């Protein structure tokens, strides 16, 4: 179940999954489903509030979902411990305007109050119907 993804903070992400992806196979975004994804990362800081952002950049083009819950803290047990590991699972979900591509790259990052929490990027992705 696990996905490669290359860190982009401090390599707090110890391991990203994602549904129905393996390694660096195609990972597969199909339009108007939900994706879900989870991240097993280590806490760097101690921290109140979480924010989760993740964006989808092809083809010269980067989007972004609104309307979605982006409170990491409505997901994991907060504040958050430093040192201490959590488990997040997160469900986005690319609307059917979003045009496909053979080429994406999606990053996923976790703010905290101190800065950024953890930062990895699957190059692996395809959005398709």
Known sequence: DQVDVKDCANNEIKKVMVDGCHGSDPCIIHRGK????????????????????????????????????????????????????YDIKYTWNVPKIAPKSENVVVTVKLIGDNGVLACAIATHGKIRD
């Open 34 to 85: 939900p994706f879900t994804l989870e991240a097993l990362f280590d806490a760097n800081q101690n921290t109140k509030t979480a924010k989760i952002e993740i964006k989808a950049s092809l083809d010269g083009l980067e989007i972004d979902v609104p309307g979605i819950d982006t409170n990491a803290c409505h997901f994991v047990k907060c504040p958050l411990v430093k040192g201490q590991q």
